[PDB]
Amino acid sequence: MSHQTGIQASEDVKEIFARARNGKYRLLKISIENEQLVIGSYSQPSDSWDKDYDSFVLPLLEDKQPCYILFRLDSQNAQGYEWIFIAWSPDHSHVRQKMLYAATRATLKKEFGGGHIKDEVFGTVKEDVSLHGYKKYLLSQSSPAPLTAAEEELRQIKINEVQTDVGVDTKHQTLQGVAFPISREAFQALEKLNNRQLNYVQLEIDIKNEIIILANTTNTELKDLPKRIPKDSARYHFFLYKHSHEGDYLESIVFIYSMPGYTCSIRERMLYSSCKSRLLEIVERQLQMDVIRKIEIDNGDELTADFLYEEVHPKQHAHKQSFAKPKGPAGKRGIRRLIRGP
Amino acid sequence: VSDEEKVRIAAKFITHAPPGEFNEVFNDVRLLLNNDNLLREGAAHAFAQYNMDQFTPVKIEGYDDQVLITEHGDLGNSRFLDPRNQISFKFDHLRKEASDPQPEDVDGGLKSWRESCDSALRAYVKDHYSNGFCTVYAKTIDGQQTIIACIESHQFQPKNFWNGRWRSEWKFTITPPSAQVVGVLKIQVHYYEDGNVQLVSHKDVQDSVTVSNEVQTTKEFIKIIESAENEYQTAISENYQTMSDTTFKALRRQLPVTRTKIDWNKILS
Amino acid sequence: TTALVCDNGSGLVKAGFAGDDAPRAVFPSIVGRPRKDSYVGDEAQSKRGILTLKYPIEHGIITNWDDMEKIWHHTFYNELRVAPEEHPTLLTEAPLNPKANREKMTQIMFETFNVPAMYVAIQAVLSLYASGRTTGIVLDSGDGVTHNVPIYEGYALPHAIMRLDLAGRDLTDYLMKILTERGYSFVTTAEREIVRDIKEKLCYVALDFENEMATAASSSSLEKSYELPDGQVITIGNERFRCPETLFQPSFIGMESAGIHETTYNSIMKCDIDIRKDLYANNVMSGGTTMYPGIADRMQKEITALAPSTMKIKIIAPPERKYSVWIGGSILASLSTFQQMWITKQEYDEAGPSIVHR
Amino acid sequence: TTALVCDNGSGLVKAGFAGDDAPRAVFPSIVGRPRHKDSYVGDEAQSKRGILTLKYPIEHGIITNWDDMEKIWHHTFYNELRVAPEEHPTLLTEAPLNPKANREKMTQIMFETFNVPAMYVAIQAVLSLYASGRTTGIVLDSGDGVTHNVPIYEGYALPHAIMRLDLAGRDLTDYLMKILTERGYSFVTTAEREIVRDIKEKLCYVALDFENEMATAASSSSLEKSYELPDGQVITIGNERFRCPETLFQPSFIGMESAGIHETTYNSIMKCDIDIRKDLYANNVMSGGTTMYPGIADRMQKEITALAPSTMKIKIIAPPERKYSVWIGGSILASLSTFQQMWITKQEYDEAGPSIV
Amino acid sequence: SDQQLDCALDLMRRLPPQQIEKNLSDLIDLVPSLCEDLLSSVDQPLKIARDKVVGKDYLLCDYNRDGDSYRSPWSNKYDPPLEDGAMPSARLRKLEVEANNAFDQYRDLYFEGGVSSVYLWDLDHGFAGVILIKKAGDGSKKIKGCWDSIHVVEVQEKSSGRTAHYKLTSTVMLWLQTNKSGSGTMNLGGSLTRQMEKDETVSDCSPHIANIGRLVEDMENKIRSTLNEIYFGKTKDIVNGLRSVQTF
């Protein structure tokens, strides 16, 4: 519906279209005449679409008069038989005819049914719409499409990127760890925690001297754990979560990276993120410390008993709730039955 | 509503169970029939066929590696064959468990070819499969000596809601100076987080191998297997792209040709 | 009764009746006011030095609404001589004309002029349909703006439209410059008209610019002769293929923009991938300044140079193209079946200002 | 000796010295070669654009033009930083999913032509995330010519979940040019593109609700701002302040078949295992310049909450310094004494071979 | 029984969606007791009928069904004919023809083919509707495929007409099949079901078919994106997890 003449279809063409969707005809010629779309010459199928085409179509093509030609292929689709819609508009015609036949094309196409047309050919010469020309139209579909230089650079990026995707690297999916020396005090405190002598070790980084030191080891229970996490500075925590899981009691250690917010300089919260990989390496590899969870909180108040339990032993996936459909057609009269069709 | 047709309905459901989901659809059909004896009687061969079609790997006690359950390993009485260690075992299909391992002599006298192929193939599987198993059979079918290499690989992540299996079968016959190599590769992926999506794929390969002695022919055969399987997998990964931008585009557009989301007030007049 | 179609161009208004073979009235769409409030059109151009000249449809879009009203009133009452209350009026609009602009020209046809019925068509689509096509890329090069409009099944592809602000008025103003540099003087308004006549009668696009320049430097073959109103003969040669050459080298008038060939290539390659091959073979010219000899043959050369060697490239240059936009509109408004599609005063009264797009 | 930090941006290169709080020098990553004065790179190529022909070696983030990228590094080292490459270790930044061959060639150029004493290549998104104070989260990096959604769990980016959107600040600038020109102004020349970019950066913003703010644009002149041109002539900018960055959420505005950044963040999170999504949703850090529009964090929070489960806790972290966070983190890392010990020295490149990095 | 219905639904969840109608037929065969209940909770592939009055094609679901006869949106009359099957409310049939034309435009702009239908019906206050799109594949053996869209919208229209609250449950059943030399055969297909709730401004400029059309379009764009970028992407990733081209 773009700049349509408004020329609709004569009822005769409505009838002949209804019959053509029963596979009745090989060919419908549609012309415009006195403000109406009307049939010209219809033909019945004789041989194959291959052999009909050149003798059925070409002599219906006037030198300087546009027309529409619907040609029934021997293919099929869901709606039924499949058609070629050819638009004949020789460019030497009178512009009135060119205008009408271009500005009623979409209206006729919709009138016939878009589902039944699989190819639309626009020809200005006989070579465009002869059988050879239709074959070449199909071949032109089998042709590669023109891409820009940027469009192809992006495809090159895509294919090498897909190689990277399936690769097994892992090392260059992170920036390599930063190894700050751990202090003897801090190391010894981590050791005493691993042997269940303490239940809390708080580590802090000397940013200037680039070493990680021991800040705290105070006796910490689950209720006092929130009071251990500062509000102004980032810190590392090792804590002995004593809890009860599914009937048996566990003393298990949790690592907590506490980072309060923009109270920390980019330098501070950068170093704290960069040293974690290597610190936990030293803890788990050298001391054989079994760390069951690594938590990253920004406020100490987050650490409720329910929070620690939910982070360590997680619940099942909560399935999505759904609202109910409309009531449907009222007084429908009928058990639902399958619409199956052999 | 014949009960004899009810069991073949139940059996059809089972043979179409996705890899790693056998127990689930089984429990489903069992609660739908609620005729446990009718199901056990009338669907036994369906269980056996599902296990032999999915290359179920099973571990026998005291034996390194696992063994694939295939139609080629069938021995009757619900007993199968492990050709690598030259035994055989009772195998329970429902629970997929291995019992009663007893040594069993196999005649036909082509051990060296099977052993060469099994060494080479099980070396190849370690190079190209994270969780792969392989079983190599040697037979004389229609009086000619045939090697059948089977490869299985799979990942079952029911918590993440996806399972995936890879089956590979490669047959070639010992006939000098050349022999025909047939292969069939199958991939099945089920992803059912908040919907149901499946990938089913298969590919048949025909190639030609040149047979001489065990050491050389097994090498060339493994090279055929390797290159053909790599080609299949690479083509699948590229096919995902071609479908995403071109094949899918046929069914529905990402945007209409105008590249503009259509204005609804404009149409409604 | 009769209807009329009105093509509001960046420099020329083309008006007349539906069913006519050409616009009955063609006048400059210029309004001038001192530093009657104003003159319009041919009147206002002659008095160029004393007045201040303003283009309402600068670059296809109506920028100034009062002046647009004066131009339209001039059309109906002086150039055409009809009563708006007794005639349905089709109007044309440019590419990417904003929705509010549309609403406003509808207003004015109904509120100010009390027209019975009216319709607004897209110039590019009428020009394409007039060539027998519903899919193709239109090159619309007129007085003050040039557009590259890809169109698929009668709908413009908005994100691929390209707009050069170099066009025919610039070509006249540049030919005037180089003629001055030869030794001539074209200062007054009559002489400015003479330069337009020279451009439209003797200029032509060259196949290869450098080869044509080298020819002109060594020969007297390319020197057509022009006669002035007094009777003097002036000779121009080199300029004939250097004036329209600016369409392909906008650096000549100082512009940083690309030529119409490069903008056609860019506009085609901004479309959907399926559509591109068809757009290459359906290149339609639809402007006044697409009337130079040789421009079609030159476009073929430059585009095949820019495009893949496999590609088939066709440039359609209708002989009737100079007024195609109008002709198209005429043929449409001259249809009984097209009468229903017009909006009507009564319907606009009830619906309001936003009825037009719908 | 102090180290060099180089952020190889899609449109803007950001170079400086390790330990500085901001890049010593920032310049466009364009190379200008005479059309058909050997070479002009950066602001010089923009200055003399007419005589020159433009090339964008990293236009999508992946280096495709090595000969021009070598010129860009020469300009960086010698003309902006004004230093000798042999005497200064160099940290380079890497695009997400940069190929291994790409990094090997980058390393080779650095060692064999610039003779750096040692060098290291780091992923952009991970540097930004780390600088944001966490090692688990999903990063949105929107720069000049590329936008990436990069999920990271405990320091490791998950390559399967990495999403590329080819829409960013370049496209936003161009679309603003277009819609202003449609309003009635004229912005079609390169000089005018620079002005319109400034208009974007100083007057654009992301609406919380798009339809409501379109209605409020129609209703009143409340959302209308004024921008004075270098001419001195003043233009009125209306709804186009927020229609422009709205293209980040609806690519169909610029005629693009793609998802909006909210939808791609959601897709990228769903490409990850269910266990970690809770940690991804609650750690959305934004990096890069195109994420600086006032009101994008609240908008993204709204949109993602819509796409997410009701129960889920979603947090968007928009640091004030994000426009340079990538570089900044890098600087910090390169300032460390312990860090450069891990870097591969020049001597170690030749006996070990190019495969080390 | 509820437990058997849950089992039936799970078993449908696991089975391939290419063959839903065969599976549903055999599943109702196993337990015919729960035929109706199951049919409500499961969506079937849409079926194409031809309207002999107008000569073209309409879609079949359980809302255009009265008894064993299906009403056509185009002739408004059931096939085979019926003495008094319930017919659309007087106001509603004009909205139906409007919405049918509108979603026909939608369908041609996105699908470039196939058939579409809309069936609406009165509620207590406000109304409801179904939008059904069926597109097939004709590319080749390499492009076999089918897309089915079912959009069920309920508009609890507020009496004033200022605002309307729209609910919509959308469901896509699709399957693509490629048959290439390199990849062999590839049957990638599934079903997704997502629902959006939102109330938007109703005006004379934006009626219900406007807001509902925008809802259906947005949901289909989102579902097709989610299908291609998440589900198909995840299956691709799984395949490469199973096997590696590069040696370990």
Ligand SMILES: Nc1ncnc2c1ncn2[C@@H]1O[C@H](COP(=O)(O)OP(=O)(O)O)[C@@H](O)[C@H]1O
């Ligand atoms: N034969 C011709 N050769 C070259 N230019 C011409 C010719 N005839 C008209 N023109 C130019 O066409 C321009 C106006 O064309 P038109 O399409 O009416 O412009 P607009 O689209 O702005 O109305 C004028 O500048 C005029 O000089």
Ligand SMILES: Nc1ncnc2c1ncn2[C@@H]1O[C@H](COP(=O)(O)OP(=O)(O)O)[C@@H](O)[C@H]1O
């Ligand atoms: N304050 C700002 N607000 C909005 N956009 C900005 C702002 N500053 C810069 N930009 C945009 O960001 C782009 C460059 O950002 P950057 O992340 O440095 O790009 P790259 O990733 O290519 O280095 C510029 O093109 C500009 O359009």
Ligand SMILES: [Ca+2]
């Ligand atoms: Ca014009």
Ligand SMILES: [Ca+2]
């Ligand atoms: Ca960047």
